[PDB]
Paper text:
The high-resolution structure of [name] comprises 302 amino acid residues and displays a three-domain fold in complex with the FAD cofactor, similar to the previously published structures of related [name] enzymes. Domain 1 (N-terminal residues 1–83 and C-terminal 297–302) consists of two α-helices and six β-strands forming a four-stranded mixed β-sheet and a two-stranded parallel β-sheet. Domain 2 (residues 90 to 215) is formed by a five-stranded antiparallel β-sheet and three α-helices. Domain 3 (residues 235–288) contains a three-stranded antiparallel β-sheet and two α-helices. The binding-pocket of FAD is formed primarily by domains 1 and 2, with additional contributions from domain 3 and the loop connecting domains 2 and 3. One copy of the enzyme was observed per asymmetric unit, and the structure belongs to the trigonal space group R32. Interestingly, three crystallographic symmetry-related protein molecules formed an apparent fifteen-stranded β-barrel-like superstructure. Thus, we conclude that the fifteen-stranded β-barrel is a feature of the crystal packing instead of a true trimerization interface. All three magnesium ions in the structure are bound at the surface of the protein and appear to mediate crystal packing between symmetry-related molecules via interaction with the carboxylic groups of Asp 42 and Glu 286, amino groups of Lys 41 and backbone carbonyl groups of Lys 41, Glu 286, and Lys 287. Moreover, [name], the brightest of the MurBs, does not contain a Trp or Tyr residue within 10 Å of its FAD binding pocket.
Author numbering: 1 to 302
Write the structure that this text describes.
Amino acid sequence: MDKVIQELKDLQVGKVLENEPLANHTTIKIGGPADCLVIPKDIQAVRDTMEVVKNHGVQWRAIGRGSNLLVLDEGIRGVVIKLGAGLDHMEIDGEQVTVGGGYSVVRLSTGISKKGLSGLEFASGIPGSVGGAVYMNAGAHGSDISRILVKALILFEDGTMEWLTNEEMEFSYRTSILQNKRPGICLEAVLQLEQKERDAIVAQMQKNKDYRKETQPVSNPCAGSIFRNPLPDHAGRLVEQAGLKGHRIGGAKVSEMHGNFIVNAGGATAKDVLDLIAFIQKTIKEKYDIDMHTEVEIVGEK
Ligand SMILES: Cc1cc2nc3c(=O)[nH]c(=O)nc-3n(C[C@H](O)[C@H](O)[C@H](O)COP(=O)(O)OP(=O)(O)OC[C@H]3O[C@@H](n4cnc5c(N)ncnc54)[C@H](O)[C@@H]3O)c2cc1C
Ligand SMILES: [Cl-]
Ligand SMILES: [Cl-]
Ligand SMILES: [Mg+2]
Ligand SMILES: [Mg+2]
Ligand SMILES: [Mg+2]
C-alpha cells in the first residue's frame, strides 16, 4: 500500500493518514488502524482518491462520523475515505437544500429548523453525516431521509458520477441502493423541505433533542442502536426486561437507560462489544426464543 499512500500524497487530496486508529473516527471511540485514512479536501479530491484505488485495485470504504460503526481491533485494510470538512458545503434555495455528504446531520437539522423549513426536525438527534444518512436512509420519529430526499450525487468506483432520484435510491427501512445493487459514495444531496411557522418547527426540533437526553446515552461514547427490533417487540425493552441494563463486559456495557445501546464506559475493545452482543443474543434467545440481529455495522479485517 506504500505506493497508494504515496500517489495520494502527491495528488494533494487532503490529509493522508497512515495506520490511523478508527477509535479516533467513531462515536463509540473503538477501532484499530486503517492502513490509509484519507480526508478529502473537496469533491475532486474524492475522485482523485477513487481513481488511485481503482488503479491499484485495493479496498475502499467511505465513512462519515463513524456513528454506526464498530470497527474491529485490527482496523481496516486498504483505503478509508472520511467525508467531513472537505465536503461540508450547504446552500438553501427556497424550500430546497443542497448539502455536501460531509455535513453534520445534527447541524443541518438544527439550522434548517431555525429557518422555519420543516422536514428535518426528526433528525436533530442523529449524530451522523449527510452521506451516511443517505446510505442508511437514517430515520427517527416516524420520518427518514427517504421522505425528503430529491436526489443524491453518487461517485461510483469506476469514476462515473450520477444523480440518482429518490425512486432510483430504492429506499426502505434503514436501506438504500448503496447498500446493495449500486455501491458508491454519496457526495452531495438535494433535500426538499416545507416552509412553515418557525417557532413550532424549532420547538419540535428541540423536543427531539430533549428526547435523546432523557432516554439515550449522553455521558459515554456509543454507536447507533445495536439490534434491529424483532417486531412487534422492541430490542431495548427485551434487553431491559431481561435485566441487562448496565451489564458490563470489560470496558463495554449496556447503557443504564436504554437496553438497545452499548456504551463505551471506558477502555472498551471491539472484542468486549462483540462478546456483549453475543451475550445479549444468547440471553434473549433463551428467555424469549428470539434471535436478534444487529443493526450496528461491524467492520474491519475481513
Ligand atoms: C447516539 C446515537 C443515536 C443514533 N440514532 C439514530 C436514529 O435515531 N436513527 C438512525 O437511522 N440512525 C441513528 N444512529 C446511527 C447513525 O447515526 C446513522 O446510521 C448515520 O446515518 C450514520 O452516519 P455516519 O455518517 O455516522 O456513518 P458511518 O460513518 O457511521 O457509516 C455507516 C455506513 O455508511 C457508509 N457510508 C458513510 N458515509 C458514506 C457515504 N458518503 N457514501 C456512501 N456510504 C457511506 C459506511 O460505509 C457505513 O457502511 C445513531 C447513532 C448514535 C451513536
Ligand atoms: Cl473532517
Ligand atoms: Cl450508561
Ligand atoms: Mg482542484
Ligand atoms: Mg443459565
Ligand atoms: Mg424459559
